[PDB]
A paper describes a structure:
Arsenite oxidase (Aio) is an ancient bioenergetic enzyme present in microbes since the early stages of life on Earth, with its origin dated prior to the evolutionary split of Archaea and Bacteria. Aio belongs to the dimethyl sulfoxide reductase family of molybdopterin (Moco)-dependent enzymes, with the Mo atom coordinated by two molybdopterin guanine dinucleotides (MGD). The large subunit, AioA, contains the catalytic Moco and one [3Fe-4S] cluster, while the smaller subunit, AioB, harbors a Rieske [2Fe-2S] cluster. The enzyme catalyzes the 2-electron oxidation of AsIII as well as of SbIII, albeit with pronounced differences in reaction kinetics: SbIII salts are oxidized around 6500 times slower than the corresponding AsIII salt.
In this structure, the Sb atom is sitting vertically to Mo and coordinated to the oxo ligand (Mo-Ox-Sb) and to four additional oxo/hydroxo groups (O1, O2, O3, and O4). Sb-O distances are ∼2 Å and Sb is ∼3.5 Å from the Mo, closer to the MGD-P dithiolene. In contrast to the Aio_d intermediates, where the two bridging oxygens (O1 and Ox) are equidistant to Mo, in Aio-Sb_e, the Mo-O1 distance is too long to be considered a covalent bond (range 2.6–3.2 Å). In this case, as in structure Af Aio-As_c, Mo is pentacoordinated, adopting a trigonal prismatic geometry.
Author numbering:
A (entry chain C), C (entry chain A): 4 to 825
B (entry chain D), D (entry chain B): 1 to 133
């Protein structure tokens, strides 16, 4: 299509944070009647741009995929246009390919959202049918009640989001957490991305450093940026584009010199710790030159050895902050002993040459001519979070960072780059045990399992074992339900419960779409995403923003916090009818009419007089934030924690944490930790000894997560009709494969499939497969091994590769050209 | 009327184009830079004797920076945010931040005259409300 | 939206027969470049219509649903417009709501066809993935070969279309028939709509009367039309509208009088035999007046008693054609004895009053004043085809028709109304038994089952027992496949085969879409529909037309006849490799590059020198038909059998069968048959005795068949989000249900669901549910009972109904107003 | 410009309409007959004090025969091929041969004046290339 309808000068405009990644770029949503349009003259459209002649480059981001026509519940049709906010400090008008599709991914009856869940769906033994919300509730609450009455909360299982943004956020984590933990009181809860109720960042938190400790502005002020297990051009695009690159280009040097008049600032440099050469390394080299990028292409799983070698080296050189150590830390002398590793040994383990280890250390830690330590920001993500022993790698890394004083100074930080946005407010987890939920379900525990805003069929570790067990246990319930005729709800609850005593499992999904979960589910409930509801969340620098409702959800779809309230109130009514006052009281506190009620009950009550125990990223000053105050802050919102609010200054927040050297520990000191080097886990080493290829896995810039929207998008499906696996071209020749061939990828844990993507930069014996996808699920070959806190080594698996055949249609239609910008 | 009124703009004759040597021209007005190239091997919807001549708008569909044609890869590259489009797959975005494929300039090949004429555009060119201003 | 793009004057135009019902209305497809349009002046657009000012009514049928923009394999985009042909004699420019959607239901990546099958799909134990055509064929042929080698043909099962139109036709029925019967040689084949390899019309055929014996013009020449077990306004729309109603209106009286200058022609009358009062009865009353319509509202399943009473009565009155009987029939005196039933007994069994029986007889059979018997056309369909003992009802009815000489005279006929179009050319069925295929699969027979262009999950009788069994057997194969790692294709064939010795069944579907069959299938293959291929078929008056290819299919979708050749050739190559000449020779004769090859090999070879045995509705003059000759005939085509072809007069055909009194029997006489009245079948009577409601079922005007396209259409999903059940308002009050409530409908055979649709005209204790639908499958409650030839009594079942709940969203969005035009 | 130029045509004031008594008018020109009716009970997208005033083009979307408003069912009936549309469900086709719902005439209700004005059409009126000729 070859034109677009401009928004009228007077079009309605609301704020919207991107639905997707951590960066949380700012957008505007323009909404106006279908049959109206703006004029081309700049003052006659809402964009203020002059379309009477060609726009210059960088003036706008605007394509047909950024527009739609939505149909409200009243039947009225409205143009929408969802475009990035030029004045938002996060993104400065940038839009990634993922956020730029938001308008296309809004619900319409005819577009990419056609298949959105819009009514409760029931698998009534042998077919999918619609059901009423009240019947769905009677069944679902009926089964949870029966389970609680007979088995207790341990029979009630969840896997639920704990993140921000779309399918997350402060309203929704509170609704669900209040339901799961305060009302039902079940400890049988895992998280969308990991199979127990735990943290990605136990070590750094226990050391006293929360993982989002800086501002995006610190990436502008750094001398050196480390990107550890991280591909930020693809996975945190506009942070890398709007903050990292301008530093590499020399555009922020004056800001550094203004802030620090007596400090040398050399040209900024960048160090990647990644076994794989990624688009981020290629782009950094393009922008900075080869001499300002170091790619430490470590052997898979060797991060701990790397950081122990570097820590030992900086200590031996004296490139550490001895007064900071003495005043603000504990356990340094112990870590020096436990973590001792020579550079020769470091090099042997990691495969990185001694000269590159020394260079990394000299760039990052050796004092500058003017006397100050370099300002070195250490950013990490899933290459180590899902690496070889999550807890140990962070221990090693943070030791290095603390010794070098690279937390709490501007231009520093040791931070998560993030995945989703963040938006966590919940009651404490109601037990003291770490429980590997997948393994419990596979062993046959639980009566009812609810997937809530996640799809572990595509995303679990050891996913094939999970899917097989869930399909089998689900079929037992399906089979039992078929014999029913004219069953009352109570009788159906009993038929199902009985089937669960014979190995069955009732499965509910609460989602935007059916997904592959529909292969197993008995019940699916329709949810609503931001713009269909109000929603709050924060980005990778803790900047909380309100995303404003501007349209109706499809059919009877509901905000997740309001679904949790619905379930709690159905359970309360059942207990009250059954004369059980003490059980009914557990389901109090869900009298919510709109999502804002959930924000008021959770985020805004944390630490307040009379409030229960509440764990909230907003802290005890959260009450200072309201929807109206966030609205007034705009897409710049406020960085948490809020320090003050009044009418004259708005919300005032916090730019960087730990700037006084007071850490989140009992004594206010950061704590060093031992980091033993143990090699690869034995479970992983066994696969490696048996099989040829390292099965590295992760993100592709264009594809978002499990592709729940992307699966319906014609452009996406043309480009990536199947999950792909990057392979070294010599390895391809040996296997007689080329671009667009299909291969089976397998080991002891499972078998899956991918289209071959030859990539020159991939190392012999290594590969990279798109994770989480709708056609060829990568996680089938990942192991069950997890760290001490049940954090999986998703990036740690080996397998063999066998040619299936040439897919001529992929060869005809898909580009296999290089995705690394030369 | 539902269609835009695209001009019919002479580009060149097909035999004058050398394999993988791009030709610059403007279409559908002097503010819309384009490139035509004889790829050397057939591609779907390529025109000319060897079904291998294609043409594109060169303004990046992300934020309009002019792309450069890379002969060795047969791609158009945007160095602003690093988007790359495949000239052999109708402008398919290989990797990048755009949400639209590179707009294809529809070319008529006239066997009788050897002429190549730009006659429309498939996709919306950066930075304009309609392809014809 | 609010405008359309007109086809340019010089736009390409091809011929297309409606994809869907028997009537086979003629359409034109206009195709032209996306960026071009026609002018509003009549000579500047291909329609020749003047869009400079408002068009008068009846000038055109044109909405946005009749247009689309398709993308071909070369990436070029084309406007299409699919509109009815004014000059086609079948429809005279009419379009039904189903045909009118054809453009919307052509494949596009963004439209209603987005979920079309584009590639082979493989369920690799616990997930769906794409696979290559060559790997699909290696697995499918591999399994069929192993089954033939070890069990013989009896282990290879099919359920396959035998019909015309889209997902059928002469090319396609031959390709599949040749594969199944000549090459594989399996007798384990059922048909899309009936669970054995049989006919809907055994009785009328054996009596010497093929069921399509007249022309549509005959409906224009009749004095009286009977519509028996038939709702023609909704199910054969344009035949009813274009031929029937003009007769009722008096518009064809002049034609009758010009043909028969010495014969009285009273105003035309219409008689419906249907337990239910339908939209067709309502419209007939609207057009003709109440006095010109008889609705014989018989008790369910009493058709045989009705026709036996009427036969007895006309014989007692002498309102029969004794010279015709004497010269051209056998068995009349016996039938008079066996079928004797008084009008009082007839009225008692049927519930129709004696006066209405006498009236129906007087209108239809009593000689007119000028001496000739009335011209009475007897049309019947699934109300008796799927009625109480198919064979017997047809025996009874044909006895009446034969005695009254109502076949072979213009304005008469005893004819199927039809369902799909027709297009049958096949080898003979290779067994001598009738085999109830669904029962065999339920009992655990077969290794491999292919659903080919049908979906018996939605459409089998006793559907719930079938789905349960198939889902179980499929899961056994799924489970066995999950242990494989790096298996060759041969090893996987062996894994699967071994699972089938343990209760399993490999399931293949060959289809346009996944369908509910995707819940059980292991392999799905993508097919192509008319317009993506050339296709030949005939309508309910035997009028054969060519539908022309005008676009590419999605991805690697293929014409069904070319799928059959690909399977055959894969099997041939395997046998040749394995050194088995005799088996390889069975797979000869599939060297086909285009669908036309299949038309030449099948239809065009029937009865020709050196041809094998071929059953073809074209007969032995089929060879006179070619694609070029049909193309020149246009959408009027030719009525089969072809009598002559030459360049000067084209294809010359046959308007009416049996006009000389020579019938298709050994002696050339029509043969009368005994029709005993046995009441309802016990299996059905048992449901009736136990349960309250007659569970009538069938068609709705707007919904086509299993809703394979309709399920993706936002208008259709708004209108009919769930299958509905028509209920008497007093029965509704008693159950406390109203419009938009959900009910369970159940008996001993199954349980299913529907939204309530109160309908004043439904009799107390009767109901009518939409059959075959995607949300609430009606067939779950149909019994296993079939007649002597395995023809199910799909209209014969009783059950109870229970309120589930009010679906407020249905109440808010769905009209429950009367579908019977007053 | 992508939108048609629809006129703003005064129909009447809301308080003059009686419940279930249809008003005839032409929109967007004298060749396009329409009906407005106060339904008497709120329907989604109804306007006026009681959110119950709706309006439609009365030309059948099948083949253009003028439909008639049936007061007892609150439907528009076409007696040419028996199509029926639901005035209470935004022109939803109850039963019939059309492939589009009856086009809705968009009404603005102005509380300051009580005026009802026709300002657009949702759906394409029979027998025209565009709603505005
Ligand atoms: N385009 C896009 N962006 C997204 C997402 C998306 O789906 N699509 N999802 C979001 C989410 S939820 C997340 S969690 C983030 C993830 O963001 P990242 O963690 O940046 O992305 P990944 O691709 O998972 O992995 C990062 C790098 O880890 C490397 N790696 C593998 N094994 C090792 C190892 O042993 N050691 C080290 N040092 N590195 C290793 C890989 O080669 C890879 O380049 O992205 C978010 N952003
Ligand atoms: N709109 C639409 N049209 C279609 C189809 C579609 O799906 N949608 N499908 C097509 C196909 S494949 C077919 S086979 C035809 C079917 O065309 P019809 O047979 O005309 O349609 P049905 O609704 O199956 O049944 C016809 C009538 O049989 C009546 N009936 C039920 N039981 C009895 C009985 O015991 N005796 C008598 N006399 N009548 C009884 C029912 O009340 C019903 O009105 O329609 C075809 N046309
Ligand atoms: S547009 Fe969206 S996906 Fe991330 S880079 Fe910005 S938040
Ligand atoms: S349009 Fe199609 S559905 Fe039947 S009535 Fe005519 S063949
Ligand atoms: S302007 Fe081209 S990639 Fe952004
Ligand atoms: S013109 Fe109205 S139903 Fe055909
Ligand atoms: Cl776009
Ligand atoms: Cl339409
Ligand atoms: Cl056996
Ligand atoms: Mo994540
Ligand atoms: Mo049928
Ligand atoms: O994450
Ligand atoms: O049928």
């Amino acid at each position: 299509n070859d034109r677009i309808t401009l928004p009228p000068a007077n079009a309605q405009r609301t704020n919207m944070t991107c639905h997707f990644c951590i960066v949380g770029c700012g957008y505007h949503v323009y909404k106006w009647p279908e049959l109206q349009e703006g004029g081309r003259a700049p003052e006659q459209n809402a964009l203020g741009l002059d379309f009477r002649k060609q726009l210059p480059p960088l003036a706008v981001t605007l394509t047909p995929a950024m527009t739609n026509v939505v149909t409200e519940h009243n039947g009225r049709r409205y143009n929408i246009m969802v475009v990035p906010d030029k004045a938002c400090v996060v993104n400065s008008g940038l839009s990634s390919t993922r956020g730029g599709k938001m308008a296309s991914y809004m619900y319409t009856p005819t577009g990419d959202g056609k298949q959105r869940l819009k009514a409760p769906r029931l698998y009534a033994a042998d077919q999918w049918v619609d059901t009423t919300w009240d019947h769905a509730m009677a069944l679902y609450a009926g089964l949870i009640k029966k389970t609680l009455d007979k088995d207790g909360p341990q029979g009630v299982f969840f896997s639920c989001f704990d993140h921000g943004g779309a399918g997350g956020g402060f309203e929704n984590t509170w609704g669900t957490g209040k339901l799961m933990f305060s009302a039902i009181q079940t400890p049988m809860v895992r998280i969308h991305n990991r199979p127990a109720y735990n943290s990605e960042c136990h070590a750094t938190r226990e050391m006293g450093i929360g993982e989002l400790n800086n501002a995006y502005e610190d990436a502008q002020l750094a001398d050196v940026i480390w990107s550890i297990g991280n591909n930020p051009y693809e996975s945190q695009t506009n942070y890398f584009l709007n903050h990292w690159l301008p530093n590499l280009q020399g555009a922020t040097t004056s800001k550094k010199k203004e802030r620090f008049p007596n400090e040398n600032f050399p040209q900024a440099r960048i160090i990647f710790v990644d076994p794989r050469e990624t688009p981020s390394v290629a782009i950094a080299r393009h922008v900075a030159g080869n001499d300002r990028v170091l790619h430490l292409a470590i052997e898979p799983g060797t991060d701990t050895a790397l950081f122990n070698g570097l820590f030992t080296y900086v200590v031996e050189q004296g490139w550490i902050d001895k007064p900071f150590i003495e005043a603000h830390t504990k356990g340094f002398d112990d870590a020096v002993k436990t973590n001792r590793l020579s550079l020769d040994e470091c090099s042997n383990i990691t495969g990185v040459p001694v000269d590159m280890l020394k260079r990394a250390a000299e760039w990052s830690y050796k004092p500058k001519a003017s006397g100050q330590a370099p300002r070195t920001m250490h950013a990490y993500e899933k290459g180590i979070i899902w690496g070889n022993d999550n807890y140990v790698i962070q221990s090693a890394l943070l030791d290095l960072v603390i010794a070098t004083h690279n937390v709490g100074r501007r231009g520093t930080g040791c931070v998560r780059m993030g995945g989703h946005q963040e938006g966590y407010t919940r009651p404490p987890y109601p037990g003291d045990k770490k429980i590997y939920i997948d393994q419990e379900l596979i062993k046959g525990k639980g009566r009812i399992m609810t997937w809530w805003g996640c799809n572990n069929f595509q995303t679990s570790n050891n996913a094939q074992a999970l899917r097989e067990a869930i399909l089998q246990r689900s079929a037992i319930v399906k089979q039992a339900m078929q014999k029913a005729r004219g069953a009352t709800t109570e009788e159906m609850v009993d038929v199902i419960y009985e089937a669960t005593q014979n190995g069955g499992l009732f499965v509910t999904s609460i989602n935007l779409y059916p997904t592959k979960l529909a292969e197993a589910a008995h019940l699916m409930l329709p949810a609503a995403h931001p713009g269909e509801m109000n929603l709050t969340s924060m980005n990778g620098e803790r900047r909380i923003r309100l995303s404003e409702k501007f349209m109706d959800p499809p059919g009877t779809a509901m905000a997740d916090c309001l679904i949790a309230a619905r379930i709690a109130n159905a359970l309360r009514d059942m207990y009250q009818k059954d004369g059980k006052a003490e059980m009914a009281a557990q389901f109090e506190g869900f009298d919510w009419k709109t999502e804002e009620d959930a924000f008021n009950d959770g985020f805004r009550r944390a630490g307040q007089p009379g409030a229960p125990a509440i764990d909230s990223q907003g802290g005890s000053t959260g009450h200072l934030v309201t929807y109206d105050r966030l609205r007034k802050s705009g897409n710049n919102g406020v960085q948490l924690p809020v320090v003050s609010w009044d009418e004259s200054k708005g919300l005032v927040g916090t730019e960087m944490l730990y700037t006084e050297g007071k850490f989140d520990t009992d004594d206010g000191k950061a704590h060093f930790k031992p980091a033993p080097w143990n090699g690869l886990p034995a479970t992983v080493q066994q696969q490696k000894d048996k099989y040829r290829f390292w099965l590295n896995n992760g993100r592709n810039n264009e594809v978002w997560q499990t592709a729940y929207h992307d699966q319906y998008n014609s452009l996406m499906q043309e480009r990536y009709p199947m999950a792909y696996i990057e392979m070294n071209p010599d390895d391809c020749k040996q296997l007689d494969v080329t671009g667009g061939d299909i291969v089976e990828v397998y080991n002891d844990f499972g078998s899956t499939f991918a289209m071959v993507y030859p990539v020159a930069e991939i190392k012999r014996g290594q590969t990279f497969m798109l994770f989480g996808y709708v056609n060829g699920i990568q996680g089938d070959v990942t192991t069950d091994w997890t760290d001490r806190n049940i954090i999986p080594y998703y990036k740690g698996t080996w397998g063999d590769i066998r040619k299936v055949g040439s897919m001529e249609e992929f060869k005809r239609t898909v580009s296999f050209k290089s995705r690394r910008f030369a | 009327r539902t269609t835009l009124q695209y001009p019919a703009t002479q580009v060149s004759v097909a035999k004058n184009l050398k394999a993988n040597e791009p030709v610059s021209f403007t279409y559908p007005d002097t503010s819309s830079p384009c490139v035509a190239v004889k790829l050397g091997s057939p591609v779907p919807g390529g025109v000319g004797p060897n079904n291998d001549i294609v043409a594109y708008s060169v303004l990046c569909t992300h934020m309009g920076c002019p792309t450069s044609y890379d002969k060795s890869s047969k791609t158009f590259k945007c160095p602003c945010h690093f988007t790359e489009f495949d000239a052999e797959k109708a402008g398919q975005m290989i990797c990048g931040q755009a949400t639209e494929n590179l707009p294809r300039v529809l070319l008529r090949y006239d066997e009788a005259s050897d002429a190549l004429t730009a006659v429309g555009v498939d996709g919306l060119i950066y930075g304009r409300q309609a392809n014809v201003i």
